[PDB]
């Protein structure tokens, strides 16, 4: 029995546990693994929750029942976990509807808060300008603070908490589109555990909306807040889109963390920033936005400069250390996000979907049109890197190889993420029958390091 020697082994982790549960038609094996789930860290299984809950819905009933017990155990433990189970189960169904209705059968205040948010963005469809949308929103959110605090929390947050106050003056509609997404700031109170503590107490000049760093907006907002004296207090930011499908976004989130862990383990100096996604339904969702970063478009627009111009002004001369650091961050983040766009086949890449942060990193956003779905290095970027024959540009091409090489060494973990999700998906990114083929094939496991180096060079050329 080599197999049991494997499961009993230290080699057995949450990843491989799901891998066997995904293939084995052995009911004796399925039931064994469904037991080992309880023996994992609650955090580690969490990352693969979308995977597990997707196998539950769109696979043999002999697999869903093996996962069901562990789910209901955690649903019973964490109110938050219970919530995100319901959300996922509904957004990916098109089976576990019975369980979903069980989860919702406590979460009343939270679901009220979500609906209220989603409804707010709906009514902004009439007001056709960006500015008109914001004015209604700010008054629309001012109504929210009339039933706060409440047993409400932002799942996007990395800690337990209650929502005490929402500074309506600070929120802003992000575009003029029919179902535009608004960004809101939320004051919360951190705690030991949500399940244990009951809602906080209530207590009833500033309120000016500017474009500034995160550290400062946190200060002006707290000063004007009644809850601005508790050491508990902390500010959160969430993007609320009431009409965009975030499932492909979530998928790309997992893929990004996974590439990130690989490069961090393989000790490859690459830099990417995945943003916390949340799936309310197939219709809607929320994003935990990257503060202190804006699109290259909104950067080139406000200052009317070239990217290289902005860098030198904001950081310093080529010779200043603060520029070298800012340039080094641009290269690393640029190189990593190339491989991310390559391996995922990310499309619709313009300076509107690419943020720029205070340190100098770049952060791609909006991950529709990946892989199958569909309807480059500009000179501006290459200039920031010192030019085609600058040493810092070789360093950019160098990181991709090292990055891609380390990606090959762990191709197994990455592909698993996508392959499972494709199961029973009417999603656009799984249009072609063989999508996973191109995905796997894009790693080029067959290639040598030398041939791998040639492919990187050839690919950088086609980039331009």
């Amino acid at each position: 029995s080599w197999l049991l020697r494997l499961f009993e082994s230290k080699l057995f982790d949450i990843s491989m546990a799901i891998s066997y549960l995904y293939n084995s038609k052995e009911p004796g094996v399925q039931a064994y693994i469904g037991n080992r789930l309880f023996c994992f860290r609650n955090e580690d299984v969490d990352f693969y929750l979308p995977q597990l809950l997707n196998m539950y819905i769109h696979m043999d009933e002999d697999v869903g029942d093996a996962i069901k017990p562990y789910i209901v155990h955690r649903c019973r433990q964490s109110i938050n976990f219970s919530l995100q189970c319901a959300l996922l189960l509904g957004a990916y169904s098109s089976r576990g509807t019975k369980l979903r209705k069980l989860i919702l059968s406590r979460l009343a205040p939270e679901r009220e808060f979500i609906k209220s948010l989603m409804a707010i963005g709906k009514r902004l469809a009439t007001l056709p300008t960006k500015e008109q949308k914001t004015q209604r929103l700010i008054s629309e959110l001012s109504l929210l603070n009339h039933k706060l605090p409440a047993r409400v929390w932002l799942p996007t947050a990395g800690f337990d908490h209650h929502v005490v106050r929402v500074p309506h003056t600070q929120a802003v509609v992000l575009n003029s589109k029919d179902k535009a997404p608004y960004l809101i700031y939320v004051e919360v109170l951190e705690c030991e555990n949500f399940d244990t503590t009951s809602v906080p107490a209530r207590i009833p000049p500033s309120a000016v909306a500017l474009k500034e760093p995160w550290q400062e907006k946190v200060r002006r907002i707290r000063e004007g807040s009644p809850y601005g004296h508790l050491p508990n207090w902390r500010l959160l930011s969430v993007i609320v889109k009431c009409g965009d499908d975030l499932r492909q976004e979530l998928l790309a989130f997992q893929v990004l963390k996974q590439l990130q862990s690989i490069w961090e383990q393989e000790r490859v100096p690459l830099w990417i920033k995945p943003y916390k996604i949340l799936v309310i339904s197939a219709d809607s969702g929320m994003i935990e936005p990257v503060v202190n970063a804006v699109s290259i478009h909104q950067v080139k627009k406000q200052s009317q400069l070239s990217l290289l111009d902005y860098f030198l002004q904001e950081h310093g001369s080529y010779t200043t250390e603060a520029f070298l650091s800012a340039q080094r961050n641009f290269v690393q983040s640029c190189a990593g996000y190339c491989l991310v766009c390559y391996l995922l086949q990310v499309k619709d890449r313009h300076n509107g979907n690419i943020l720029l942060d205070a340190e100098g990193h770049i952060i791609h956003i909006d991950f529709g049109f990946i892989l199958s779905s569909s309807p480059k290095l500009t000179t501006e970027f290459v200039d920031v890197m010192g030019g085609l024959d600058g040493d810092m540009f070789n360093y950019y091409k160098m990181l991709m190889l090292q990055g891609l090489i380390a990606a090959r060494k762990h191709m197994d973990k990455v592909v698993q993420i996508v392959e499972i999700m494709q199961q029973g998906s009417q999603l656009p990114c799984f249009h072609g029958s063989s999508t996973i083929r191109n995905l796997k094939e894009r790693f080029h496991m067959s290639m040598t390091e030398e041939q791998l180096q040639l492919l990187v060079e050839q690919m950088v050329d086609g980039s331009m």
Binding site: S1, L3, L4, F7, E26, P27, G28, V29, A31, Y32, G34, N35, L37, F38, P69, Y70, H73
Partner: protein
């Protein structure tokens, strides 16, 4: 020489690893991956040497010469414990009235998947006056003990 030759049966719903209980007790091997079969190993009881003949299935010739009955129910599947009444009937109809019945709760390693109460299933043993024990072929917990008692209690 071996003193006596016992014949005990392994009955119950398919999937409860009674063929694995059989393997672990005699050959000491367990396989996660999956006709009528029997196998025997001898043990020393009360200063005696006994070749316990464990039978296994996947009809009356089965219960012919049956000395002790091993009712194996899965703890992770409540329906298996439910069919014990249907398995007693099969025993009541075909099995020797003298045979000693020991209720077996296998797959006890599945602690987090327990569907059958350890205390309750032990209560059904008293209502029927039969010995009870929960076992696990994957870690060999209470495996040799089950036959050690059934073969000992067969006298």
């Amino acid at each position: 020489e071996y003193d006596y030759l016992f014949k005990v049966v392994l009955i119950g719903d398919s999937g409860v690893g009674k063929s694995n209980l059989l393997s672990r007790f005699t050959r000491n091997e367990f396989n996660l991956e999956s006709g009528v079969e029997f196998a025997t190993r001898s043990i020393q009881v009360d200063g005696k040497t006994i070749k316990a003949q464990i039978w296994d299935t996947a009809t009356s010739a089965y219960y012919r010469g049956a000395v002790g009955a091993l009712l194996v129910y899965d703890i992770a599947k409540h329906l298996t414990y439910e069919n014990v009444e249907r398995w007693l009937k099969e025993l009541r109809d075909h099995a020797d009235s003298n045979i000693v019945i020991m209720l077996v709760g296998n797959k006890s390693d599945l602690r987090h998947l327990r569907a059958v109460p350890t205390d309750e299933a032990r209560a059904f043993a008293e209502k029927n006056g039969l010995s009870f024990i929960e076992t696990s072929a994957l870690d060999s917990t209470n495996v040799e003990a089950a036959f050690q008692t059934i073969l000992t209690e067969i006298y």
